[PDB]
Amino acid sequence: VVAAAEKTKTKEGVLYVGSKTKEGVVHGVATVAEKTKEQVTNVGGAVVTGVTAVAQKTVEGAGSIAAATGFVK
Amino acid sequence: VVAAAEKTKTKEGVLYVGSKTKEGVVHGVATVAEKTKEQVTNVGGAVVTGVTAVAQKTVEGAGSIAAATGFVK
Amino acid sequence: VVAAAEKTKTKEGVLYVGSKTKEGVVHGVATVAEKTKEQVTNVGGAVVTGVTAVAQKTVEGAGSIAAATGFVK
Amino acid sequence: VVAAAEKTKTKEGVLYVGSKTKEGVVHGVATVAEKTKEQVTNVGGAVVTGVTAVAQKTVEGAGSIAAATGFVK
Amino acid sequence: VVAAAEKTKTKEGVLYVGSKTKEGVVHGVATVAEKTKEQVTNVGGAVVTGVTAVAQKTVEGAGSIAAATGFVK
Incomplete structure (x- = not known):
């Protein structure tokens, strides 16, 4: 399980959010x-959870996720 | 399970969100x-969950996900 | 299971969202x-879930997902 | 299971969404x-789920998904 | 199972959506x-589900999905 990321190197990347919630329950990442x-x-990578969720520009740079999940019997 | 990502190198990438929710329940990523x-x-990569979910420009840079999920018996 | 992504290198990429929900229940990614x-x-790649879901420009950069899911008996 | 993506390199890519829902239940990706x-x-690639779902420009960059799902007995 | 995608390189790509739903139930991708x-x-590629679903310009860049689903006994 190997992950390699390499990076070699007017409004840009700007977010405005307004949120008004009376009640919020958020569970994120849950295992029960x-x-x-x-x-x-x-669970790998980016999880955004919300009554109001915004993800902007999550991986401009290179991103790698490698997962090996399970069992051997 | 190998993932490799390489990156080599007026409004741009701008988001406005307004959200008004009276009640919100959000579960994100759940295993029960x-x-x-x-x-x-x-679960791999980007998960955005919301009563109001926005994903913008999630992988401008290279992104790799590799998964091997399971069991050997 | 190998994934490789390579990237080599007026309103652009702009989103406006307004959402008004009285009640929201969102489950995201769930295994029960x-x-x-x-x-x-x-689950691989980008999942956007919402009462109001927006995905914009999700993979301008190269994106790779490789999955091997299952069991050997 | 190998996926490779390569990328080599006035309103453009602009979305406006307004949504008004009294009640929303959204399940995203579910396995039960x-x-x-x-x-x-x-599940691979981009899934957008919503009472109001918008996907714009999901893969301008090259995107690859490879899946091998199943069992050997 | 190999997928390869290569990309080598006035309103354009603009969407306006207004949605008004009293009640919405959306299931996304479900296996039961x-x-x-x-x-x-x-499930591979882009699935957009919604009471109001819009997909615009889903693969301007090259996109490849390869799937091998099943069992050997």
């Missing part, structure tokens, strides 16, 4: 197990 | 197991 | 198992 | 198993 | 199994 034997979970 | 033996889960 | 033996799940 | 033995699932 | 032995599922 009840009465479970084996649970393997991988 | 009840009474389960084997659960393997991989 | 009840009483299951084997569940293998891979 | 009840009482199942083997479930293999891969 | 009840009482099933083997279910293999691959």
